[PDB]
Design a protein around this ligand. Structure first.
Ligand SMILES: [Cl-]
Ligand SMILES: [Cl-]
Lengths: 605, 605
């Protein structure tokens, strides 16, 4: 008794008429739903009118001043890492917070300056500064280039949000992103070492910069101020055990101002800007083609990190974050502020962690931080003068510590997925050495190739029956399975295609007869059926269809029957389209391994 | 009653000691087997002493003169396409045949000049000629560059043979190679159009050359000789229906010599060389770094095509061709002749087809061709003077026709594998336009990405039981399957990893409850078990382990049980290593979908 399943009728509707009908059903021209899109595009007018202030005002207000003071050195630093004046980091943070409060659904994430992104902006800035030469007084050209790159990144992000092409985010694996952030953290530490030691080594760019910078540091170690070094050592000793950062920076600034440490030729930040808020300057609009390629990566890593963090903190509690709206928000946190003097913004884990430790479920707290920043941007900025600039490096290293600790999870990573660990290590090496962008590209492709390698050398085994059941499983992995003689079931856990067709043939020949050599031996001068378990064969390429046909023909030439079992509907469709089973030949494809085994047993009898 | 299969004990031998022991068992220092390696490396002293001359001498001798005369215009042409003097093509063909008779196992293949490879050599030659400027009198530098590239390609091929790294050949799919050869044939036709029309348009190189050459042809169409055009039209008319080529070239040469067609400013080949065989010149040995990258592709496409053709013609009858020995042979068909004045060699289908039509199973015929070439290289070369050079273009186009006919198989290709057809079309476009090398790289990566896309959007469905059996199959593909209520089996035919984890979650939520929205609705204010068929899940990434854990946790939060069935041994190992089933929790993983369904039915009762 053979199975006689009947296939369902395929849908005849495949033209664009049905697509147009379903697009109209989607109501592109939506009456009375334009308010919904306005509310969807402006989440701010959805929870502020329904704000439970009596239960969250204290939480939002609390630690907002601490976070704002805590966002203060981060800006004066990463701006320096980005090749920008310190006031530009403050502008970036304030504008990012204010705009994300307008457009934002995570309600727990901390948008603003991201170290990895600032390192990448810095690379593009220095390249354009050199390609140009070093009323653009160096810093003016730097901020112009940074704002242009930010505008391009925001345009790309909003285009990906509108075109619904955000699925590219799936190509950035969590392990690959962790490796990239670790490598970028190593690069940031190497860059900040020069400020930590007080040297004046030249700008190093290109593949191997990390090594060039370290070599320069070693070469110029004798030109050590020994004052900034002492301050940095004390700050590292105090902050390594880990509000501590705010106290440290306040005490360091007070000591530097009182003792006049600059008399020892101590490098310090300058009077960057007064209350300021200078009138906005439009982007270059002519330099836009030159720095588009870098903006590609900046936009991707920016939106990938933001979406990942927002989804994580939404699924933690009250998951109501829309991916497309966060696309639009992170895009507009890089378009409107780029009209002003700001660089790219993204979610920062080290500062979101600070708000998570002390805070509540209200985005209004970010506004408070902005207000604090605004206050810092109005009258408290001169109070930040006379910073030792070694405390800045200590403050950057301490924050990176979060990403640098990932090396302690390598034994745990290995004990779960070896190839994921290898991808992580390769991405970390390619980001630390080589280039940050080149490192990301190397990581994304190596992960895709690892998926190709996993396919390339797959598992292949013989199947045995489980006693008193209709279950077949690998003999090479399980024990005490009945294997009747003259029938050998071969399971090949992989898609059969151009990459692994040779491996499939070699494994089948090694475990069963290898009919080619037998045929040549017969021409010069036990087994009767073989069942191929196609349950794990995901798809079939033209090579796979040809390989299966060749296998069947070569085995039938000797006299060994070949039966295919548990084929997918798509695999069966490919086999019928590939002209494998001829027309109504029958007894060639089976719906289960048990059915094929029973048929093979009956055929000999 | 639950299944209680016991797993086999894993092998404790994993260190390098066992590898060293098996390497010694391989007998690296082999006594009395050095003769075997000598015979293996020199196949010539394995069938010549055992040559059945009485049954194959007539076949080998027959059509050898025709093939040699037929290899004559092919050289005078493709050398011109390769930016070389015509005598260099004759040298290449003669040396390739002679050396492959020494080292060769296919015994039916025709090594020699390959059109696609000559086009690629030409590109590298013209670039180096320009990078240098245009006792190297242009042609001397061209042959020096070509010989250097050939030496590098042969070194790469022999290195791949010795290192056993020939598996790279699996990345060049048959459809991708067919597309590349079609695009390269289009490029060759475009290049030979200038000789067909008799114009003198400038050298065009870079991406889009095909378009630049065609634009130049259209611009200079008015400068048509109308004599070479008439000769080419007559030759095309005669040869298009398709020994015909030899008669055509002989008649054209005789007519040109008798009528003195060169009086009409007809471009013609010159007195390239006398009997010649000038003393060999060593490769550049200093220019070797510059043209290594091009030699990478030349070596790969050369060895891939040669191995494919040899394996095909061996498996057709008497399969005794070793892949590694053919690696060595094709490498040494590019190393020793590069010491002389020759360029790269590979199997040519159009000329192997000529020998297949008229020939026998003896490589000695190739020697005969070499002899003919040698005779042509000794005294018959001046007889080939005064060739119209339009017959050459006609002779190149006719031969390409074999690869150009592939466009007629597109409807057949679509009716078998749509993605393979798309890869073929993309590779053909990237080889015709863009660059030949860039086209190959674009094809190889797009095929790997298509394997990634096939994974990205996979099949997912609900499984129903087949009546009076223990077989579950897709409800969306088959008909009349029992689906008990409260239990829904979800089959996801793909590996679960970072790329398709979101798709897996979305499909499972769409077809079953979507527990997140249900949980938020329950907090604001039928199904009990779900069985996941992991039979088609090939592997599990760190993301896949996390996704499965998250799915189980979220479904158990609502109150819906999640059971995993038919997991691979590797998938089970990943789940245990990933801390998914805790310790001895039981009733979480099942060996069959029927077992899980029975357990789910029992649990409610
Ligand atoms: Cl950071
Ligand atoms: Cl060809």
């Amino acid at each position: 008794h053979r199975i006689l399943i009947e296939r369902q009728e395929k849908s005849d509707t495949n033209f664009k008429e049905f697509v147009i009908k379903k697009l109209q059903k989607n109501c592109q021209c939506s009456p009375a739903k334009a308010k919904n899109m306005i509310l969807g595009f402006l989440p701010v007018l959805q929870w502020l009118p329904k704000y439970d202030l009596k239960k969250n005002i204290l939480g939002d207000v609390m630690s907002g001043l601490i976070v704002g003071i805590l966002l203060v050195p981060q800006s004066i630093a990463y701006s320096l890492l980005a090749g920008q004046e310190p006031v530009y980091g403050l502008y970036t943070s304030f504008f990012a917070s204010i705009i994300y409060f307008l457009l934002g659904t995570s309600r727990h994430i901390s948008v603003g300056i991201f170290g990895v992104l600032c390192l990448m902006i810095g690379e593009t800035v220095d390249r354009e500064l050199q390609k140009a030469g070093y009323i653009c007084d160096k810093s003016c050209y730097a901020i112009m280039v940074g704002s242009t790159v930010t505008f391009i990144a925001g345009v790309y992000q909003v285009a990906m949000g509108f075109f619904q092409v955000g699925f590219v985010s799936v190509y950035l694996s969590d392990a690959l992103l962790s490796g990239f952030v670790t490598g970028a953290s190593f690069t940031i530490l190497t860059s900040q070492a020069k400020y930590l030691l007080g040297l004046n080594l030249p700008r190093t760019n290109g593949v191997g910069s990390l090594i060039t910078t370290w070599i320069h540091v070693f070469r110029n170690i004798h030109k050590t101020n020994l004052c900034d070094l002492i301050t940095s050592l004390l700050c590292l000793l105090v902050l390594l055990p880990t509000p501590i950062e705010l106290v440290v920076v306040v005490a360091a600034t007070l000591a530097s101002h009182f003792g006049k440490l600059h008399e020892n030729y101590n490098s310090s930040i300058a009077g960057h800007i007064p209350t300021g808020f200078m009138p906005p300057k439009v982007p270059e609009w002519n330099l836009i083609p030159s720095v588009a390629v870098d903006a590609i990566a900046i936009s991707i890593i920016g939106f990938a990190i933001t979406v990942s963090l927002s989804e994580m903190f939404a699924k933690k509690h009250g998951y109501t974050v829309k991916a497309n709206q966060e696309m639009y928000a992170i895009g507009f946190c890089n378009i409107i502020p780029s009209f002003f003097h700001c660089f790219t913004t993204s979610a920062a884990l080290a500062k979101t962690l600070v708000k998570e430790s002390t805070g509540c479920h209200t985005q209004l707290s970010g506004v408070v931080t902005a207000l604090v920043l605004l206050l810092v941007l109005l009258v408290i900025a001169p109070l930040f003068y006379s910073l030792q600039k070694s405390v800045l490096g200590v403050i950057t290293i301490v924050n990176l510590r979060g990403a640098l600790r990932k090396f302690r999870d390598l034994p745990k990573m290995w004990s779960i997925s070896r190839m994921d660990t290898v991808i992580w290590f390769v991405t970390m090496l390619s980001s630390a050495l080589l280039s940050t962008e080149i490192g990301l590209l190397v990581g994304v492709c190596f992960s895709i190739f690892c998926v190709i390698l996993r396919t390339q050398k797959p598992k292949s085994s013989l199947l045995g029956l489980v006693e008193e059941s209709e279950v077949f499983e690998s003999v090479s992995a399980y024990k005490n399975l009945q294997i009747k003689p003259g029938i050998k079931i071969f399971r090949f856990v992989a898609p059969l295609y151009y990459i692994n067709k040779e491996c499939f043939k070699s494994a089948l020949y090694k475990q069963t007869v290898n009919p080619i050599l037998i045929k040549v031996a017969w021409k010069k001068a036990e087994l009767h059926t073989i069942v191929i378990d196609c349950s794990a064969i995901q798809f079939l390429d033209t090579a796979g269809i040809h390989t299966l046909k060749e296998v069947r023909r070569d085995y039938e030439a000797i006299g060994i029957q070949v039966l295919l079992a548990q084929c997918n509907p798509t695999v069966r469709d490919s086999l019928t389209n590939g002209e494998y089973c001829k027309k109504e030949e029958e007894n060639l494809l089976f719906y289960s391994v048990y059915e094929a085994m029973a048929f093979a047993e009956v055929s000999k009898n």
